[PDB]
């Protein structure tokens, strides 16, 4: 799928902005000041890494190989999901907001109160 549509999806979420790093042009998704997921090509191919996720931390226990969970920002601290293009919109949409729902958990009451409004 193209990540052009994921993008503006991810701007569809209410307190998302984009904070890109001007190095490798890698895009951090973030709120104020709580990163949940970043967003940057490496091998001209789409690749997402996202903080310490339940299920994402389950992908890398149950199965194995293929998308390949790789240490080149952190393997532990962080799931890194090659998206590459032949990988389908399905899971992914579900990905983005598992790691969204975590972000307005670990938000405070004086920021949760506000994204309730939007």
């Given at each position: 799928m193209?990540?052009?549509e994921?993008?503006?999806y991810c701007m569809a979420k209410p307190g998302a902005e984009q904070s890109v790093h001007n190095?490798?042009?890698a895009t951090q998704i973030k709120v104020e000041?709580?990163?949940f997921?970043?967003?940057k090509e490496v091998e001209n191919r789409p690749a997402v890494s996202l903080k310490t996720s339940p299920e994402l931390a389950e992908l890398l226990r149950q199965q194995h190989s293929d998308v390949?969970?790789?240490r080149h920002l952190n393997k532990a601290h962080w799931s890194t999901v090659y998206l590459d293009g032949s990988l389908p919109d399905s899971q992914i949409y579900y990905l983005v907001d598992a790691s969204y729902q975590?972000?307005?958990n670990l938000l405070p009451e004086e920021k949760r109160?506000?994204?309730v409004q939007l």
């Open positions: 193209t990540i052009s994921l993008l503006q190095d490798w042009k000041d709580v990163l997921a970043m967003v390949r969970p790789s975590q972000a307005v109160k506000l994204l």
